[PDB]
Design a protein around this nucleic acid. Structure first.
Ligand SMILES: [Ca+2]
Ligand SMILES: [Ca+2]
Ligand SMILES: [Ca+2]
Ligand code: NA
Length: 285
DNA sequence: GGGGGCATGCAGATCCCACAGGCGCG
DNA sequence: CCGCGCCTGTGGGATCTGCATGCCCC
């Protein structure tokens, strides 16, 4: 097939679903492997097939019977990833993992990792990447095992980025309690609270719910007023369209919202049509 | 000729998704 | 009374992330 993704839409999807990896396994020879991975359900397998088509790089492998992932692992292959994220930077705290990813690329590019000092520099880089060093790798190289990293406070660059972030970690659904209510919600780890609260001002609507800050690792940005949803959330994603099955979930979302606008959610066939839309909305296509 | 990186995966940990009920308020 | 929407709460899987190596080339 043939497809191409907007560069800013892709960065937003990377901020939500991407992952930068640096594995150092024993072979004192060491297996060092840089990677960038986006693993998704098979329902969204065409995104990864399309992102591979945009970057013209990467491999697609099966992960189980229901999941698929795009993994970029070759050295020359990783050059296109950095060139994309140098001009379209990541916004969430994952950008720090990319920064350490870029440093690791340069060390391997200069062939420094083939010596003892080069491996020591990368295990120090890996210490700050994602979940840090494992217990076995922390047995050696206890010099700089500090897993903490400078936090990343950044603002939303554009709505094209938001479409890719929403396509990842967002959700469009409809509640029936009978009464009809459309709800838009984005969840995220508490580490990007300042970025999540940016959406209140960036969108002019929505609320932030956290619960007990202790013993809960993630907050929620949610908008429930229909006026804010029909006027300030749906047009902004019609101009900057989403990707993956989230688009079709969003498509049927506005189809239901059009019925609520015409006040047609009182007829028996209106809710019967609304219920049929929901029956294949998120559990289905 | 062999050391390092490619090929192509498999396995673990958790951050999400897609909701739920209660209820004060206009 | 009706119905909207703030507010608190969540199971579990789709994510994020980690682990693995025989074999290829140069
Ligand atoms: Ca995410
Ligand atoms: Ca997702
Ligand atoms: Ca996600
Ligand atoms: Na959705």
């Amino acid at each position: 097939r043939r497809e191409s993704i907007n560069p800013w839409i892709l960065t937003g999807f990377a901020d939500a679903e991407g992952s930068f990896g640096l594995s150092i396994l024993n072979r004192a020879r060491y297996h060092t492997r840089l990677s960038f991975t986006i693993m998704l359900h098979n329902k969204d397998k065409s995104i990864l097939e399309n992102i591979q088509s945009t970057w013209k790089v990467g491999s697609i492998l099966n992960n189980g019977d229901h999941y698929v992932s795009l993994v970029v692992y070759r050295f020359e292959d990783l050059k296109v990833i950095i060139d994309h994220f140098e001009k379209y930077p990541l916004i969430t705290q994952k950008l720090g993992d990319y920064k350490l990813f870029k440093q690791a690329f340069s060390v391997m590019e200069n062939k420094e990792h083939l010596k003892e000092n080069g491996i020591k520099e990368l295990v120090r880089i890996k210490a700050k990447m994602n979940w840090g060093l494992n217990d076995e790798l922390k047995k050696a190289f206890p010099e700089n095992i500090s897993k903490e990293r400078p936090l990343i406070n950044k603002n939303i660059p554009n709505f094209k980025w938001l479409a890719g972030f929403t396509s990842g970690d967002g959700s469009f659904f409809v509640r029936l309690r009978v009464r009809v209510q459309l709800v838009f919600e984005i969840s995220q780890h508490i580490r990007d609270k300042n970025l999540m609260n940016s959406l209140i001002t960036y969108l002019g609507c929505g609320h932030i719910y956290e619960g007990n800050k202790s013993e809960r690792s993630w907050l929620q940005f949610r908008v429930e007023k229909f006026s804010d949803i029909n006027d300030k959330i749906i047009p902004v994603f019609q101009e900057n369209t989403l990707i993956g099955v989230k688009l079709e979930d969003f498509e049927d979302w506005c189809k239901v919202a059009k019925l609520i606008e015409e006040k047609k959610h009182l007829t028996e066939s209106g809710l019967d049509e609304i219920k049929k839309i929901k029956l294949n909305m998120n559990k289905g296509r």
